[PDB]
């Protein structure tokens, strides 16, 4: 398939999981991707693996020096901006008594003012080539919390209000502003905790079932819901939530 | 040419006109044998006919026991497994509590929701036999941010967005999905009839987006939804409504 | 004594039972009239005759359309307004599409919706008349947040839910709002029945807080949405669930 | 007397909800700490209430003034029974226009305020027995509006806090809820008026009511969420917006 051919994709967090998923699946529909990373080394080394139709390049995407510098970079290199994802972001564990304030900020500022700040400087561009679609991350969480993850959880609501504002600053501009919800996903996150466990499999077990499908989602899996937004066979849809959670989110299966 | 659902057995009801014929026609052009089942017999097979020997019509009213499970006895007889089914069979009525007759409140709660009922009483034991399948309702953006005065409809349309999560935790654990898609305003030979005999532009400006939807773009979703590129999502609600429950822009 | 219904004409549905009639009652110590309308013509009398003179009990499956429209015409013979309605007529099966039969279905949908639908239809003339109201619906915290194998049920509260929305829209212009409670898991004699401990620890785990709620506890907010202090709210869900739909505590 | 001798903090005390708050808060027998970034205007309130109020300047996104906050009401009174976290603010423009500073100083005050003030408040709580956080979200969370985009943002970070928190903290005996307003009437608005009756009229039209709510209004909502009649109530919106966000009656 060629859903996305010729056009020009930003991923951001797209060294690792979801981002990278994404990014490689993109660039397999015909895209030219942007590899936007916190990590250079990873943002290189996705776009050396996807080919000449793919650069990485380092951002923090809370440092708006950073966010303008990738659309300049974007631009440079082939004149426009169709699709950005806003896929960077982290989260800790803690409640508002243990969450040092220094690390609410952290959060706050990556996850919610990233996608704040990829679009301040994305926007200007999509304008003058027609519009365009963008596709932020949130988080099942977003609407069915989980204990102990609070600035995290805090930031993903951020997400999915933001997403409406968006949708409906920027329609009369062409821009469609959708986001995915995912589920609990095997990610490096996931993947250093399980190298560090004793008991990795249970673990894992444990994750399962936050699902009444009972097992994590892959990157892949949700790079498929970032296909379908960021492609014309969605073209109807905006300021819209995409959830791929495993049904984690639709009602309590443990009870 | 995807093949999203190559050799799939796929039910739509409601595969007469409007979003299912749209829904029943993308299927098989992604490979799909289909079950075009109408209320009206003659529509059923008009969209079978034109899709050819990988589709038959089948006159089915949703409300009806004996007509959905004898759906399924034929389905099963002609392709032996059920791999996905499309509730898509529904109506709508003008008015509000105060003004829609009971026998049409009724009407529509017998169609719009027990048809999802039946018809999913008599697919799920074959789905069970068959290492399960993806079951599609069709809720409605109104079903979240109402509308006034098409009232028995709305009301309808939260009864199967609830019912879509309950199925989902019903059936996971048989390798069932169930999730649903939530349609905006969708243009039709209803809108052209009314267009035919201000209005437009008020329909059009429900959406942020400021027009209707087409049924095939409806169709993306439900081919999203049937196919393996949402294996993870059950449960879920699939707005495709151009922004027309996200918030009031007017 | 809060009287924050005080002299108003108040309509309770399930008012026999559980939280219509924690409901009545309440209704009924905050000054209002109140009409105890059930299925079981003997539970609405008893609470009725408990209340004493400002309320009278009426039998009424609020699934017959005759019955409905009978209550509002004794309702009004009587005191000649209506202030309130409280739509909490309503029941469950356990069971899921494959082994629910069609009959239990649509029974559980006509009383559950239909009666909403058919109680209202003959309130709205009458509160058009005197100045507005207010309607209140009893949804379910599984309207949003699932559980298994009551799907009928959870279905019908969903259709509740939304409803209750579209009623908010059709009827502002009339000075009525339309709101609904969604209650979490209420305490009451079917669970004194079916109870032995551990399966109490089961369903109080639904709750965050870890408890069941109490009909008492549901009826406050029903006063709430029924009184003057809520009088900017309309279609709106107030959920007193314990924390049964907000994420997933047992994980 | 729903809150007779029950220790109570409002923050954006000083004004609008958290004004009218704090006073139906002491109506029904609450000590009030009046907490707001603006001295003079927290002063204020507490001298209308008198000596069951005192008056302090907090800006909530600093966490020296909120953990200083607490101790003052702990030494003046032994506990905190009820939080209400009203301190915030809104900006006009988009992704686009909003400043980063602006972007920044919303979501420091919007929703770091919450995390400050639980933060030294729930450790108080949690050895008196548990109490009841109320936060201030807004009918835009769910149902968006355009061109105030931060402010929409915080917002809908606020409501997913609420449930975190209500998560967090249930076994410690405190419920956190939230309020969602609608438009509320308030001196900026008077302002921003004085065509006036046009203006008027649209901020009206976003409420299916056709009206702007008032403070006290929201302060009733306040007043249910703290006393003990809705103590099976946590990690709940109750919106009080005269039906903004239920759907678009226009």
Redesign the interface.
């Known amino acids: 398939?060629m859903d996305l051919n010729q056009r020009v994709c930003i991923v951001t967090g797209g060294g690792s999981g979801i981002g990278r998923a994404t990014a490689e699946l993109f660039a397999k529909n015909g895209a030219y991707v942007v590899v936007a990373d916190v990590n250079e080394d990873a943002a290189v080394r996705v776009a050396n693996e996807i080919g000449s139709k793919a650069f990485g390049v380092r951002v923090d995407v809370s440092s708006?020096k950073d966010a303008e510098s990738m659309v300049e970079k974007t631009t440079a290199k082939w004149g426009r901006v169709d699709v950005l994802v806003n896929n960077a972001g982290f989260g800790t564990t803690g409640?508002?008594?243990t969450?040092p304030?220094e690390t609410?900020?952290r959060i706050?500022?990556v996850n919610?003012?990233g996608?704040?700040?990829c679009?301040?400087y994305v926007?200007?561009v999509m304008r003058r080539n027609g519009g365009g679609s963008i596709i932020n991350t949130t988080s099942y969480?977003?609407?069915?919390?989980?204990?102990?993850?609070?600035?995290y959880?805090?930031?993903?609501?951020?997400?999915?209000?933001?997403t409406?504002?968006?949708?409906?600053?920027?329609?009369?501009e062409g821009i469609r502003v959708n986001a995915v919800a995912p589920?609990t996903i095997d990610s490096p996150y996931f993947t250093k905790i399980f190298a560090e466990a004793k008991d990795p499999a249970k673990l894992r077990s444990?994750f399962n079932?936050?699902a009444?499908?009972?097992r994590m989602?892959?990157a892949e899996?949700?790079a498929?819901?970032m296909?379908?937004l960021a492609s014309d066979?969605?073209?109807?849809?905006?300021?819209?939530?995409?959830?791929?959670?495993?049904?984690?989110?639709?009602?309590?299966?443990?009870?």
């Open positions: 398939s708006a409640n508002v008594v969450i304030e609410w900020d706050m500022s919610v003012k996608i704040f700040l679009s301040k926007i200007p969480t977003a609407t069915s919390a989980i204990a102990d993850r609070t600035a959880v805090a930031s993903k609501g951020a997400i999915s209000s933001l409406r504002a968006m949708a409906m600053d920027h329609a009369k589920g444990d079932a936050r009444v499908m009972d989602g892959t899996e949700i498929e819901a296909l379908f066979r969605s073209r109807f849809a905006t300021g819209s939530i995409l959830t791929v959670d495993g049904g984690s989110s639709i009602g309590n299966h443990l009870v």
